[PDB]
Symmetry: C2
Subunit: 131 residues, 2 copies
């Protein structure tokens, strides 16, 4: 279904990368934060939900969605309840950027635009088609 997203955290250089994947397309959005917290996860979800018609979110760590602030964000936004190559691409460009956050966003760019259609083309088509 086009409203389904997966969200997980990965760790790199003592920082945390929040990665959201649109399951039907493989499109990704990510952000770098200092550490995993409910406040960060809630903020990320609210941003995501304002961009895309987000219906359901899955995760590989259920406990990360247990805070009051995260349940509040899912409530208000009407939400119900890849790190393999992404880390490959980050390593490849890591040299080219000073800050890890900059390398992560270059990696997301590369991932979303690389063709086999690209993930970014597929999300827009999947969603436009459903309107």
């Amino acid at each position: 279904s086009p409203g389904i997203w997966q969200l997980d955290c990965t760790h790199l250089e003592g920082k945390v990368i929040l990665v959201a994947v649109h399951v039907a397309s493989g499109y990704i959005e990510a952000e770098v934060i200092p550490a995993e917290t409910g406040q960060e996860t809630a903020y990320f979800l609210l941003k995501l939900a304002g961009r895309w018609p987000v219906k359901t979110v899955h995760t590989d760590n259920g406990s990360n969605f247990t805070s009051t602030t995260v349940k509040a964000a899912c409530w208000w936004a009407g939400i119900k309840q890849m790190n393999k190559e992404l880390k490959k691409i980050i390593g490849q460009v890591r040299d080219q950027a000073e800050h890890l956050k900059t390398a992560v966003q270059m990696a997301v760019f590369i991932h979303n635009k690389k063709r086999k259609y690209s993930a970014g083309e597929r999300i827009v088509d999947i969603i436009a088609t459903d309107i």
Copy 2:
């Protein structure tokens, strides 16, 4: 044209809101930062460019795109060179959230999803149609 975006900063509560508008749709993305800096503007652009096929960016303050870090981001990403209602919507929900950043993202959500199609529907259609 569907690759054209406008980016500007506004000030509220001693903070800065970076607002990007997809000119053909009226779709917006925003972020809250402590103050205007080239590093922030460059990061925002790199994020945006990884999400959408960004071709050209306009602004109402040209000097904000003069730093080395901003020119670097536009170079790597292949980029060449609403605050009215947004501030209305922020005021309306501001009470409902503690932190300004949370109110800004609720406002972006409201803006992008409100129908007359919504801005979020129009961007996806405009872009899908162009692929």
